[PDB]
Amino acid sequence: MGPHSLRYFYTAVSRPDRGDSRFFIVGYVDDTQFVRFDSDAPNAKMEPRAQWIKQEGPEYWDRETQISKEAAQNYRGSLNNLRGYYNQSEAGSHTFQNMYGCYLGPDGLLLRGYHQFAYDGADYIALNEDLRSWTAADMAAQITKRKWKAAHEAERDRNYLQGTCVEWLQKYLEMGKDTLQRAEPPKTHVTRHPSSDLGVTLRCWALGFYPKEISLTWQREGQDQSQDMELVETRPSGDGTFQKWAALVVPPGEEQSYTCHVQHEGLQEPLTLRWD
């Protein structure tokens, strides 16, 4: 019913005082993490992080681990080059990030493909949407842009994105359909806390929900006032699901006249709640 995505997140960190770098990979299908890699780990491997991926054999695991280990090194090289391009200080730690993956239309084709990079938390370079040009954020990226322009690796990249990534995304979906393809509706309730003798707080609670996106509004008699409600940022539950609340102060004895409205993929129908 919805688009799906396969998505990886690379973080490379230099330790010049140490004189070495650390490399991380995490992979996601939609909101669900399924793999990780860390280069500091003694016999570093790509490692399952959801039950369903474990139904893949060693040959999968060797391949990915092989590639993750090459990545550690090319990335370590990148940090050195980056310093050179930026004429960066010898003793200062620096951060390099890459995120990429696939969105999948119910049309079985790649809706959108993204490959992007940042250096010290600032955008550095990105594959464009047609998946055939780069945007360079500065002069040091222009260099990369010339260097990658020649290597033709946007060819390499569009092919993976339009083929391989789309292909594995689908396989992952079948493997973990009992989890990846089921929305989990939030368990909801309303609490009451007296923020003032004459200032009662109502907090509408939504817990256990997957996937991440949700809508929580508060209304009185068909009237909405989010100018007033306190909303928290959606936060994970710890177990693969998320949690949010939205809260407001109401005049004492007027509780019944407030309705919290909740919209979510997992829900049969949107649910409005009153205190009780």
Binding site: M46, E153, T164
Partner: peptide
């Protein structure tokens, strides 16, 4: 499935 990159910046 991981993308493989042979080239540094």
């Amino acid at each position: 499935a991981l993308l493989s990159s042979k080239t540094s910046v």
